[PDB]
Ligand binder design. Structure first.
Ligand SMILES: [Ca+2]
Ligand SMILES: [Ca+2]
Length: 312
C-alpha cells in the first residue's frame, strides 16, 4: 500500500486527550480535552485555539449537577454558529462560542436513558449521526464498550428526536456520512475501534439506516484502531488509525486502504480539514497535541459550510 510522508507542523500542545478538532462558521478552531481531571473526577474541556500563536483558551468546562463531562467529538452547526459536542458522560451537548452550553438529552425517543457519546457527523439534511461507545450518561457509573458490545449509534434529527438507530458495537468511534453529488445523504460509515472494522449503512432517510456491512478493514493488530474520520472532496475517507502511526486513506468503495499517511507519532486520534484548503489538523494522544499537514486535495464540505438559502 502506497504511503506518503507529508510534513507535520505543530499547532498546539498539552491538551489532555486532544480530540474533536473542528472549525466554526467564522473559521475559528476548536479542540476538546476529554481527559482533563480534577481530583480523579472528569472535568473535560472545550478549547479555542489561536492558530496564529497556538495559544489556548478554554471556553467551556461542561458539568451537569456536579458531574464533569468528557467532551470527545465536535461538529459545527449551519443555521447557528454553535458546536454540537459528543460527551462520554453527558451525551450530546450544544456549546455556544461564549462558553455556555445545554444538555440535549437525558433519554432517547424510546424513553431509554441516554448513553455517553464520542463523535458525531452532520449530514447535509441537518441530521446528526452520533456514536455512543460509553454506557448510560451521568449520574450513572461510567462505562465504555471497549470489551463488551453495548456501544450504540444515534441520530439526532432536525425535529429534535434522539433516535437510537443501532447498538451492539464494541466501541463505535469515528463516524462520517457519504453524500451523492447533488447533496443527498446515502451512506453512513462507523468505526468500531478494537475490531479493526469500518461499518457502513445505507441511509434511507432521517434516522433510517439499513444494510449494515463491514465496509473497510483497518491495518494492524496493535491496541487501538479506527478513531476519527472525515471525507476529502473526492469522497476518499481518511481515518486516524490510533496506535498505528498512520491515517488510513480508503477509496469510495472501501475494503483495504489505497494509501496510508505516516504521522510523526503513534496515536493519531482525530482529524479535520480547514475549510477551503487541503490542510488537515490532526490530534494525537502520545503528546496530547495538535498538528497540521497538507493532504492531496480539499476536504468534503462539512454541513456548517453549506448554505440553507443556497441556489445551487
Ligand atoms: Ca474519537
Ligand atoms: Ca473531523
Amino acid at each position: 500500500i502506497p504511503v506518503i510522508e507529508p510534513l507535520f507542523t505543530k499547532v498546539t500542545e498539552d491538551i489532555p486527550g486532544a480530540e474533536g478538532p473542528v472549525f466554526d462558521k467564522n473559521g475559528d478552531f476548536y479542540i476538546v480535552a476529554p481527559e482533563v481531571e480534577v481530583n480523579g473526577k472528569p472535568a473535560g474541556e472545550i478549547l479555542r485555539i489561536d492558530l496564529k500563536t497556538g495559544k489556548k483558551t478554554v471556553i467551556c468546562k461542561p458539568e451537569v449537577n456536579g458531574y464533569g463531562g468528557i467532551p470527545a467529538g465536535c461538529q459545527c452547526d449551519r443555521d447557528a454558529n454553535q458546536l454540537f459536542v459528543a460527551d462520554m458522560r453527558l451525551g450530546l451537548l450544544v456549546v455556544q462560542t461564549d462558553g455556555t452550553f445545554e444538555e440535549i438529552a437525558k433519554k432517547d425517543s424510546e424513553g431509554r436513558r441516554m448513553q455517553g457519546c464520542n463523535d458525531c457527523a452532520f449530514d447535509y439534511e441537518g441530521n446528526l449521526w452520533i456514536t455512543a461507545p460509553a454506557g448510560e450518561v451521568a449520574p450513572a457509573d461510567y462505562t465504555r464498550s471497549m470489551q463488551e458490545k453495548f456501544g450504540s449509534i444515534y441520530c439526532f434529527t432536525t425535529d429534535g428526536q434522539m433516535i437510537q438507530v443501532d447498538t451492539a458495537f464494541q466501541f463505535p468511534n469515528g463516524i462520517a456520512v457519504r453524500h451523492m453529488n447533488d447533496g443527498r445523504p446515502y451512506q453512513l460509515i462507523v468505526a468500531e475501534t478494537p475490531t479493526k472494522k469500518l461499518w457502513s449503512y445505507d441511509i434511507k432517510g432521517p434516522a433510517k439506516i439499513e444494510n449494515k456491512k463491514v465496509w473497510g478493514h483497518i491495518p494492524g493488530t496493535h491496541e487501538g484502531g479506527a478513531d476519527g474520520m472525515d471525507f476529502d472532496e473526492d469522497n476518499n475517507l481518511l481515518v486516524a488509525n490510533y496506535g498505528s502511526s498512520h491515517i488510513e486513506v480508503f477509496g469510495p468503495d472501501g475494503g483495504q486502504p489505497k494509501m496510508r499517511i505516516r504521522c510523526p507519532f503513534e496515536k493519531p486520534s482525530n482529524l479535520h480539514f480547514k475549510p477551503q484548503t487541503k490542510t488537515i489538523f490532526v490530534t494525537e494522544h502520545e503528546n496530547n497535541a495538535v498538528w497540521k499537514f497538507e493532504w492531496q486535495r480539499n476536504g468534503k464540505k462539512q454541513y456548517c459550510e453549506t448554505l440553507k438559502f443556497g441556489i445551487f
